[PDB]
Amino acid sequence: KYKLIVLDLDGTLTNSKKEISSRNRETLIRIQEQGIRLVLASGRPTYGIVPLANELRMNEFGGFILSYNGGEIINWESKEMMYENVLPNEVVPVLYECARTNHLSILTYDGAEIVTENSLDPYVQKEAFLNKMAIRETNDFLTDITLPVAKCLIVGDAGKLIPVESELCIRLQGKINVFRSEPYFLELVPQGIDKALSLSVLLENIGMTREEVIAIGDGYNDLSMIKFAGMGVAMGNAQEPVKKAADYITLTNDEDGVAEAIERIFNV
Numbered sequence: 001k002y003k004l005i006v007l008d009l010d011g012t013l014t015n016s017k018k019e020i021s022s023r024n025r026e027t028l029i030r031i032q033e034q035g036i037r038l039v040l041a042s043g044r045p046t047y048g049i050v051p052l053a054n055e056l057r058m059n060e061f062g063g064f065i066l067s068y069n070g071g072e073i074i075n076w077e078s079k080e081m082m083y084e085n086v087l088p089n090e091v092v093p094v095l096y097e098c099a100r101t102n103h104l105s106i107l108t109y110d111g112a113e114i115v116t117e118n119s120l121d122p123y124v125q126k127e128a129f130l131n132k133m134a135i136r137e138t139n140d141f142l143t144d145i146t147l148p149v150a151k152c153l154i155v156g157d158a159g160k161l162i163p164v165e166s167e168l169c170i171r172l173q174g175k176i177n178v179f180r181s182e183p184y185f186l187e188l189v190p191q192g193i194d195k196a197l198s199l200s201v202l203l204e205n206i207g208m209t210r211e212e213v214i215a216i217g218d219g220y221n222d223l224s225m226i227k228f229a230g231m232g233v234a235m236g237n238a239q240e241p242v243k244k245a246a247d248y249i250t251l252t253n254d255e256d257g258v259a260e261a262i263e264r265i266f267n268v
């Protein structure tokens with residue numbers, strides 16, 4: 001029946017320490033050794049997902065990474081890029097100028113580094129810590145980044161960040177996707193890009209149907225993929241409308257809710 005499991009990271013696969021428990025790690029290696037393919041799907045840049053993919057040995061079992069909210073899909077065994085999307089270059093100065101005017105930091109990603117004009121902003125430091133990426137600070141953001149980029153982030157207290165969200169939603173005329181993940185992280189990613197849409201592109205490419213997929217997540221950004229999957233699973237710490245949309249509600253991330261769901265579905 002089921003052939004593929006898609007997992008969100010923060011609040012889902014990882015615990016409150018942002019680590020993968022021994023139980024989740026061992027159940028996920030087992031189910032892959034048994035032939036089930038794993039997908040990690042996250043807003044994180046690819047570099048922030050890689051250590052986890054390697055810990056789960058996905059490079060050995062044909063796993064996929066869906067990074068940047070679905071903007072990139074990579075086969076982690078072959079390292080072949082299946083789906084790639086970037087922001088229109090011409091929108092980047094508008095993002096920069098809005099951040100500047102609202103005195104908030106903007107960042108983007110350039111290989112192994114986060115690039116920003118303020119490496120001392122605690123929210124920039126938060127994103128770097130989470131993704132284990134060095135920060136390269138610049139005084140000329142637009143000159144010092146390598147374009148095109150898969151995504152930018154504007155960061156700051158929600159009270160200051162929400163009006164930036166509102167202003168860019170209006171000004172950008174739908175040209176890119178604008179939304180907050182954490183309350184202090186404003187995601188700026190290509191138009192249309194979300195986890196379910198990108199999952200659907202993966203399935204079409206590998207010849208699978210959505211009835212063959214389990215998706216597990218917690219946040220409103222996972223709602224669409226939990227509905228799309230044949231078996232949508234909400235974490236016990238999920239948003240209430242996410243729980244209501246799911247086919248199954250599991251335990252919290254800290255309670256190994258991923259392993260508890262997988263073990264009820266498969267015989268490991």
Ligand SMILES: [Mg+2]
Pocket residue numbers: 008009010011012217218219
């Ligand atoms: Mg999450």
